[PDB]
Amino acid sequence: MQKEFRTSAYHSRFQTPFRRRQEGKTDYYQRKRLVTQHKAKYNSPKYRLVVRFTNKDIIAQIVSAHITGDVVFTAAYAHELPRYGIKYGLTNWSAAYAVGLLVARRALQKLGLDETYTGVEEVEGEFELTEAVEDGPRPFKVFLDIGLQRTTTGARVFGVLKGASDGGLYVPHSPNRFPGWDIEAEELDAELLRKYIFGGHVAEYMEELLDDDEEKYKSIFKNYIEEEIESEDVEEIYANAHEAIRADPSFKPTEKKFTKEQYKAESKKYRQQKLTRAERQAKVAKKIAEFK
Amino acid sequence: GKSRGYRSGTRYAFQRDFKKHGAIPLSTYLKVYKVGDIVDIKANGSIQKGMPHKYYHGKTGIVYNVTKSSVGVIINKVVGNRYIEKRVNLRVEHVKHSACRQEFLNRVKSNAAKKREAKANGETVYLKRQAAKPRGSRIISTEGNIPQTLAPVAYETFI
Amino acid sequence: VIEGLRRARYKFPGQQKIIISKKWGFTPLNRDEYIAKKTNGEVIDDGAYVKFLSRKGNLEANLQQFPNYQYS
Amino acid sequence: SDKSQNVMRELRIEKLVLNICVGESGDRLTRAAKVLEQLSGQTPVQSKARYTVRTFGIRRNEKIAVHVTVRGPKAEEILERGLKVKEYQLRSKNFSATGNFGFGIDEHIDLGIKYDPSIGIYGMDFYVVMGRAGARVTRRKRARSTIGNSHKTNKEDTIQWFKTRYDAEVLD
RNA sequence: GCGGGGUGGAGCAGCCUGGUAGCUCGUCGGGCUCAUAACCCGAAGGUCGUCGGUUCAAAUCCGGCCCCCGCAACCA
RNA sequence: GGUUGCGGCCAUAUCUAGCAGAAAGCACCGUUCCCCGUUCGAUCAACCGUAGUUAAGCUGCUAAGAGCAAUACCGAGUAGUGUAGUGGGAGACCAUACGCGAAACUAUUGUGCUGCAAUCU
RNA sequence: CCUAAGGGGGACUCAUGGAGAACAGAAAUCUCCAGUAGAACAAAAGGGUAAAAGUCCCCUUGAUUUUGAUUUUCAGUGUGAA
RNA sequence: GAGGUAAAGCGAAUGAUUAGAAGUCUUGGGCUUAACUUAUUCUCAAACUUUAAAUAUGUAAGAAGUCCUUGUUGCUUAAUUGAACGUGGACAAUUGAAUGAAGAGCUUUUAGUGGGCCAUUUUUGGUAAGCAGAACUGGCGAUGCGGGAUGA
Numbered sequence A: 001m002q003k004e005f006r007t008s009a010y011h012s013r014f015q016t017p018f019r020r021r022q023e024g025k026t027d028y029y030q031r032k033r034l035v036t037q038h039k040a041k042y043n044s045p046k047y048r049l050v051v052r053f054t055n056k057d058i059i060a061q062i063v064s065a066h067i068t069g070d071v072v073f074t075a076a077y078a079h080e081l082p083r084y085g086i087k088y089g090l091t092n093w094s095a096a097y098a099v100g101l102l103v104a105r106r107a108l109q110k111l112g113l114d115e116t117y118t119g120v121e122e123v124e125g126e127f128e129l130t131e132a133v134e135d136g137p138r139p140f141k142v143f144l145d146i147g148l149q150r151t152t153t154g155a156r157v158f159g160v161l162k163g164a165s166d167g168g169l170y171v172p173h174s175p176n177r178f179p180g181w182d183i184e185a186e187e188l189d190a191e192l193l194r195k196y197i198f199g200g201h202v203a204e205y206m207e208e209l210l211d212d213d214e215e216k217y218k219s220i221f222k223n224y225i226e227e228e229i230e231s232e233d234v235e236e237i238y239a240n241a242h243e244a245i246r247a248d249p250s251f252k253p254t255e256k257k258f259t260k261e262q263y264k265a266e267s268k269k270y271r272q273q274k275l276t277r278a279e280r281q282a283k284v285a286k287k288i289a290e291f292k
Numbered sequence B: 001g002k003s004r005g006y007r008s009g010t011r012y013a014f015q016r017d018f019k020k021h022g023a024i025p026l027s028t029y030l031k032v033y034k035v036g037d038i039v040d041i042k043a044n045g046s047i048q049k050g051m052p053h054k055y056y057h058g059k060t061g062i063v064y065n066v067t068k069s070s071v072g073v074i075i076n077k078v079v080g081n082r083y084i085e086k087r088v089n090l091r092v093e094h095v096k097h098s099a100c101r102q103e104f105l106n107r108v109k110s111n112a113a114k115k116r117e118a119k120a121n122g123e124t125v126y127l128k129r130q131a132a133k134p135r136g137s138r139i140i141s142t143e144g145n146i147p148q149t150l151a152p153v154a155y156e157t158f159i
Numbered sequence C: 001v002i003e004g005l006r007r008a009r010y011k012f013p014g015q016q017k018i019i020i021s022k023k024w025g026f027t028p029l030n031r032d033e034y035i036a037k038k039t040n041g042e043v044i045d046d047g048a049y050v051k052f053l054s055r056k057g058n059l060e061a062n063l064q065q066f067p068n069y070q071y072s
Numbered sequence D: 001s002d003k004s005q006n007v008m009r010e011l012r013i014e015k016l017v018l019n020i021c022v023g024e025s026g027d028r029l030t031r032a033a034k035v036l037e038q039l040s041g042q043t044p045v046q047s048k049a050r051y052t053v054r055t056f057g058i059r060r061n062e063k064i065a066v067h068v069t070v071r072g073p074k075a076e077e078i079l080e081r082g083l084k085v086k087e088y089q090l091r092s093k094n095f096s097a098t099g100n101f102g103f104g105i106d107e108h109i110d111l112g113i114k115y116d117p118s119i120g121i122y123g124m125d126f127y128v129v130m131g132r133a134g135a136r137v138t139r140r141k142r143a144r145s146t147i148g149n150s151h152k153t154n155k156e157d158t159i160q161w162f163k164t165r166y167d168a169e170v171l172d
Numbered sequence E: 001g002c003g004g005g006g007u008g009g010a011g012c013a014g015c016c017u018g019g020u021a022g023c024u025c026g027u028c029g030g031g032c033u034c035a036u037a038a039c040c041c042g043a044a045g046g047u048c049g050u051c052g053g054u055u056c057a058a059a060u061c062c063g064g065c066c067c068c069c070g071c072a073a074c075c076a
Numbered sequence F: 001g002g003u004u005g006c007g008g009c010c011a012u013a014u015c016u017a018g019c020a021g022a023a024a025g026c027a028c029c030g031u032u033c034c035c036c037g038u039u040c041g042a043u044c045a046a047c048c049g050u051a052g053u054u055a056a057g058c059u060g061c062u063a064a065g066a067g068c069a070a071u072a073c074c075g076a077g078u079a080g081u082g083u084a085g086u087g088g089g090a091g092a093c094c095a096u097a098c099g100c101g102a103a104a105c106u107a108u109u110g111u112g113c114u115g116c117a118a119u120c121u
Numbered sequence G: 001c002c003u004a005a006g007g008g009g010g011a012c013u014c015a016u017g018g019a020g021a022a023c024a025g026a027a028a029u030c031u032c033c034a035g036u037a038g039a040a041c042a043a044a045a046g047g048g049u050a051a052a053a054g055u056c057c058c059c060u061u062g063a064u065u066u067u068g069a070u071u072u073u074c075a076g077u078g079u080g081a082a
Numbered sequence H: 001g002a003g004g005u006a007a008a009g010c011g012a013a014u015g016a017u018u019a020g021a022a023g024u025c026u027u028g029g030g031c032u033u034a035a036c037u038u039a040u041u042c043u044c045a046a047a048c049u050u051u052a053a054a055u056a057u058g059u060a061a062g063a064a065g066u067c068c069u070u071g072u073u074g075c076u077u078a079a080u081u082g083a084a085c086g087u088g089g090a091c092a093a094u095u096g097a098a099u100g101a102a103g104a105g106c107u108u109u110u111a112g113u114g115g116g117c118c119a120u121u122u123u124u125g126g127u128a129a130g131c132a133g134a135a136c137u138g139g140c141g142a143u144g145c146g147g148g149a150u151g152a
């Protein structure tokens, strides 16, 4: 009764979106405004802090765009954080701060701007931008790029932002999306933000859950129990981690348990190779024969 | 009454290509233009700002000015019995590099390299291009290629 | 039919020709081509017209639609 | 495993929605909003007429209906009260092609709600939305996609699940 | 080439300036009368020439088409 | 070779219908004290990675598959067209000379390639 | 003609069809699926636009100040507009 | 580089359009009658279109160039990055396609004119016109001479 829709003309005239748009990974409107440079700043690149969250990891890359594709300047991951003394909550707000700090220190060390622009060393949760030194190189400037993630006050992407800013990178931002901002009296509760930097929210949850529902506390906080880490011991974890990141931010790659050819040979055992022309033609001849 | 508005007559010239609507690929925004570059002008109908007039659609010119989001381009326009130098401000979506110039710069490099090779060898080479010359003499073998005779064919209808 | 068309010609301005086609009916096939396609099971009736065999597309539907097809 | 017996294929309620469409505003709409708030424990939302119709006495962009979406344990509680009013008896036609279904109730005090003169008696529409784990892939912002053909709900599975799980009869 | 008209059975409003179709006569039911007219109390009856369009809303505002009645068609 | 993040070109990448998928990754997945957003912790936010699952996403393979792309002693040197003549023809039009040259049609082939970084049985 | 129908940001997706839910029906509101734009964008027509240029929410006044350069019409004068 | 005319196309989008056929009757009539759906079928478009010529059209083919080193600046970069203009050094008659060039550049001043018309081709209105209106080129006007008997 109603015309069948998926016709050959519908498919023929269909215009497919950009490949990374149909995968739902790239916002090209935002990417255009983020990437395009002043034409009178000819080959000078704009740098993006790409901050991405998975269900288990935090990805922070400093990226510049080019015709053949983006080029990574430095990258940091939350799964690197065991090396600095953080083992659990690898998607905390606080792990986000640590990864931002790591990527900032790593980039400034790659640039030679370590001793200049050491950032905020005594962290108190205040809002602060990296200021330029007199008669010196200007701070490394990067722009925050959060992809498809929503701008809500308290979100972890701005935790990576805060870590990177305190690490010495100049990242323009306003404090009104940090945990601690109050929209009525528009100022920042620096105490709440500095609590969020050092895992204070998780520490409070640990204490209250231990004192109220011990069995749920047992299931949720199993790793802290087995390592014997009470709610009193979290802030020193994050402070020691920050000190360790500041002392040695160089990238260390995993010592590969297998070389590339072993990985390749072991994965080629599992890829269905396509048929050939003759094989498909023989299948058609047979399927005709059975139909007779 | 007649109508001679700014975009009159542009029904097809300013259309996007078939199945080429929508977002501009970012390569358009990553190109770098310098004063003296030679650029082709092509209006993009989806970018209403910084558009060329229909006259400059399909014209090629010299870049003379570089601003935040656009280039200034010099075009020569026949007005009566002489050319007038025109200066048009165009956002980069409406601009593209000209490929003939890249070819010519390549030839400049090749001529220099060949001249240097000859100078190191001790001789002189010719750098001017040449038009296609008439072919020289040749011998054609008939091995497995005996001349085969053709004739005009009779008329036939097929209706 | 030739005389019938001969009479209709006088109703038109200018000149017209009456041509006998080599093809089977209103089909685009020559008479021998149509007989070959018919005896090979590659045509079926569709009212006043026919449908021809396609060697493209879903093989199962092609085989069902022309059951008498002699695959060669 | 490639098996339909897998535990991520277990059917379950996504949401029950509670519709009360009265053809006007003021007292009746307020009282219907109140009955939904009492029943559901939630504040409902009012819907507007998308265009004036004089045959219905309805007028464009005017508050007419009210509804509320309930998901979780309270959804199945309200559903089981609704089916005790329906006497655990439904028809085949009640089930949509996708695998959802619903029914209606002519009086809320039949759902164990005490009569109040301040509210009166109101009918009510139920509609339960079925689903399986992984429905997020069609809901989330990033990397949104569709659902595999096997993982889709349908009328057949929804009816079988309903009869087995509620000990109820579905009349063809 | 223009101009007006087209709305209950009849003759007319309402258009303008969108949101309700009003008037007189007529028709139908009951009454008064021996009966009829007059008179008295009640009731029906125009989707607005027609096909579209716009508008949240068309008798109305915006075009095409159909019927009716008219004005202009001059200088040799 | 697999996978992820950010991409370039933007269907050889799309679409339908089946099937398969080790390792890691990704994912679904658990919870609601805290920042936050909702009629609804569904989406958005946050917390745990702890209880589970490859079922779905994702990846690959299959289809005389649709679409798309490419090719050609395919059609066709056809249609059209620049130049020429005191060429032909009542004319509409047509041929010839020196040049350019389609589309539909037909048949066959293919079905993403790739940059930077990280990681993996 | 418009204090938004101007500016910025955000979230969402439109016409239409199919299948379902008391009164409820062709048309009320509620649900899911399909949906390349078949909608919408003040007004003619053409062009343009889908994580938007459409719909809805939040904040606003860049519809401001100074005076040059340029494009169209063109005498390369004026006006209008950009 | 640009273009959307000619041609082409419509079992490709929009719009127009002839004929059956198989379904659907859950949708309205009288086994039908129309509608609907599917695969087909005949024919079209100045104000339709995926495709798409020929002719015509933009630009380049160096000395005001190329390469090396490093000067200026209040602009620009995270920068010792660039941008623009340079010093010093090198590359010589093939200084970077063809053919031509009673030479190239520059200025002032002023006449007449501002009714046109014809031909091939493209083309609009009109039944058409030695009619009316456009496009490119050549002409007549302004021009005799040989030919077309005669004739812008």
Ligand SMILES: CN[C@@H]1[C@@H](O)[C@@H](O[C@@H]2[C@@H](O)[C@H](O[C@H]3O[C@H]([C@@H](C)O)[C@@H](O)[C@H](O)[C@H]3N)[C@@H](N)C[C@H]2N)OC[C@]1(C)O
Pocket (backbone or CB within 6 Å): F084, H120, H121
């Ligand atoms: C193939 N396209 C052709 C195009 O080339 C051109 O054809 C001309 C043709 O018309 C000329 O012919 C024309 O001119 C002559 C004479 C006055 O020169 C007349 O006698 C003739 O009637 C006239 N049609 C002919 N002499 C040369 C072709 N190239 O014009 C006609 C056309 C059909 O468009």
